Amino acid sequence: APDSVDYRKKGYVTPVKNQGQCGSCWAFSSVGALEGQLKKKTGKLLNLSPQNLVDCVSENDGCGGGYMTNAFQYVQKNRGIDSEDAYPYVGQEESCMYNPTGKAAKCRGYREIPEGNEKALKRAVARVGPVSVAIDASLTSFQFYSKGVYYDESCNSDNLNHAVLAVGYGIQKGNKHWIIKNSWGENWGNKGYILMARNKNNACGIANLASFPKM
Numbered sequence: 001a002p003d004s005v006d007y008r009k010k011g012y013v014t015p016v017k018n019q020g021q022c023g024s025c026w027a028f029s030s031v032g033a034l035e036g037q038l039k040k041k042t043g044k045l046l047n048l049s050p051q052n053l054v055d056c057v058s059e060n061d062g063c064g065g066g067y068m069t070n071a072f073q074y075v076q077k078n079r080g081i082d083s084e085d086a087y088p089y090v091g092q093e094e095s096c097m098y099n100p101t102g103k104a105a106k107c108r109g110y111r112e113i114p115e116g117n118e119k120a121l122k123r124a125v126a127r128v129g130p131v132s133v134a135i136d137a138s139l140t141s142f143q144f145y146s147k148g149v150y151y152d153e154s155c156n157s158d159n160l161n162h163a164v165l166a167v168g169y170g171i172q173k174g175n176k177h178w179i180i181k182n183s184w185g186e187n188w189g190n191k192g193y194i195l196m197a198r199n200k201n202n203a204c205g206i207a208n209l210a211s212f213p214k215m
């Protein structure tokens, strides 16, 4: 596996979004990983529908939270997910709409990365593509991050309360990091992204609830 991987440079990552006034971070993390696979398989980079997931993954809690594994299972059993153009984001839960048209992407299930194993996470990012992960984002230091490789001793590996997308990994001035795509708009962090410490004992629980869809 390479020392460095950044899917933004290959054109495998769509523009940063803003989940608005809804706790749908999990829907954005799930579509980001599906967008990566679609691009890999077809060459087209398209915005898929987080709203489709918010409204229809009944096993999840809409704007109240949810799991990415549940979202991948729903796409598999439903035969696809709509594009953002076909099922636009409105930022509140609505009834699950059915678009008779074709779905924009499909998946054959998912895989979970072994709990706490950052080395397996690194290999999966290198070989598969962007990976959905969950972290503890409760700290003021995370919320107001601006630059550098983020590391905070108070981060709690067992308090997973936010979902994001790992789109690469690398090293900056001697510090190994993970390149993380957030869904709080481009004004947050560094143009919507954050570099999080890599190989510093699963800091913030980065490798504790990671998964990717099979396409």
Ligand SMILES: *C(#N)C1=NC([N][C]2[C][C][C][C][C]2)=C2N=[C]N([C][C]N3[C][C]N([C])[C][C]3)C2=N1
Binding pocket: 022, 023, 024, 025, 026, 063, 064, 065, 066, 067, 068, 134, 135, 160, 161, 162, 163, 209
């Ligand atoms: C996002 N946005 C989001 N996600 C979750 N839960 C998931 C986090 C990642 C792993 C799978 C579960 C949310 N649960 C609740 N909320 C609303 C906002 N939170 C309310 C509780 N406080 C303590 C933290 C913020 C979620 N939002």
